[PDB]
Amino acid sequence: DPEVTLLLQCPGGGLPQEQIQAELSPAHDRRPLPGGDEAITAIWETRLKAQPWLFDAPKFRLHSATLAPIGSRGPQLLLRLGLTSYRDFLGTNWSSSAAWLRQQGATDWGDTQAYLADPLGVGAALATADDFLVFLRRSRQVAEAPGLVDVPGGHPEPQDLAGQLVVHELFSSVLQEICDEVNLPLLTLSQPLLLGIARNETSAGRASAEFYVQCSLTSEQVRKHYLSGGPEAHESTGIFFVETQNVRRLPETEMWAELCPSAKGAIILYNRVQGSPTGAALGSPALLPPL
Numbered sequence: 001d002p003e004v005t006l007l008l009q010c011p012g013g014g015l016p017q018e019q020i021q022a023e024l025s026p027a028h029d030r031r032p033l034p035g036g037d038e039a040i041t042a043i044w045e046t047r048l049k050a051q052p053w054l055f056d057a058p059k060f061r062l063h064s065a066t067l068a069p070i071g072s073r074g075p076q077l078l079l080r081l082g083l084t085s086y087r088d089f090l091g092t093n094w095s096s097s098a099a100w101l102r103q104q105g106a107t108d109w110g111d112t113q114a115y116l117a118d119p120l121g122v123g124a125a126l127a128t129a130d131d132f133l134v135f136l137r138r139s140r141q142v143a144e145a146p147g148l149v150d151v152p153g154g155h156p157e158p159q160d161l162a163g164q165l166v167v168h169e170l171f172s173s174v175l176q177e178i179c180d181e182v183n184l185p186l187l188t189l190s191q192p193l194l195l196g197i198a199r200n201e202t203s204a205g206r207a208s209a210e211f212y213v214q215c216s217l218t219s220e221q222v223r224k225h226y227l228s229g230g231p232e233a234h235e236s237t238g239i240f241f242v243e244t245q246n247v248r249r250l251p252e253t254e255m256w257a258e259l260c261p262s263a264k265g266a267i268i269l270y271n272r273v274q275g276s277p278t279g280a281a282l283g284s285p286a287l288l289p290p291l
């Protein structure tokens with residue numbers, strides 16, 4: 001799967017909010033482009049002169065994420081974050097020249113991402129009470145990954161002593177994205193666990209934080225809530241469900257070729273962090289079938 005790389009696999013089946021620190025610093029920002037940020041401004045002007053209803057929005061930038069020594073007390077992860085924007089994303093990661101920017105970043109900074117916006121996404125492996133994961137079909141008319149299968153998620157917009165408010169907004173945003181798109185009541189959702197961070201190599205290496213969320217509703221009840229909003233209540237064109245039993249071998253199915261890279265990241269991390277048992281009971285052959 002060359003279109004997805006794992007940047008972080010969390011320990012302990014996934015990290016809760018209270019175990020994560022963020023450092024939000026202008027040291028973590030994109031570097032100005034070698035010939036100047038005027039190239040980003042020009043692409044934006046061209047875009048707005050065709051689609052004048054578009055608007056810019058701030059985003060978090062991922063610089064790096066460092067895990068504590070395994071089995072340790074105290075905070076377990078440090079997220080190093082900067083600020084970026086939708087405009088900067090359109091002029092860097094989305095640009096036809098994005099690979100030239102990655103080569104220049106290696107040369108100038110020893111950092112393939114130094115000249116990329118790299119907005120931080122969020123996604124969820126959302127499980128039902130009857131042990132299915134939730135999938136969404138993307139419209140064939142959107143700009144990125146048209147017609148592909150996705151999981152719930154989005155690209156959070158901003159607003160350890162400002163750090164803890166940032167971690168709070170990241171965890172809050174994955175629940176809000178589930179409530180907005182799947183139309184689920186917030187009180188049917190568990191507090192999220194961070195499974196890990198995946199990079200989309202088809203979008204010049206931008207990263208998404210991938211979470212596990214449990215729902216107290218069954219697959220049939222989730223479907224009812226999704227559909228009862230009507231076509232204007234969701235950006236996706238359909239919902240569907242795969243048994244957690246069958247997610248284990250999803251990379252061997254015809255579905256895998258239809259999954260967008262960030263959804264592939266979510267399912268790889270679910271299989272490694274929540275699946276793959278470590279103990280004698282769940283590791284026994286009748287509960288963990290060989291092959």
Ligand SMILES: COc1ccc(NCc2ccc(F)cc2)cc1
Nearest residue numbers: 059085086089094119143144155
């Ligand atoms: C041409 O416009 C596009 C609009 C949206 C997208 N994809 C989602 C998305 C990625 C990164 C973001 F920062 C914000 C949204 C790509 C291209």
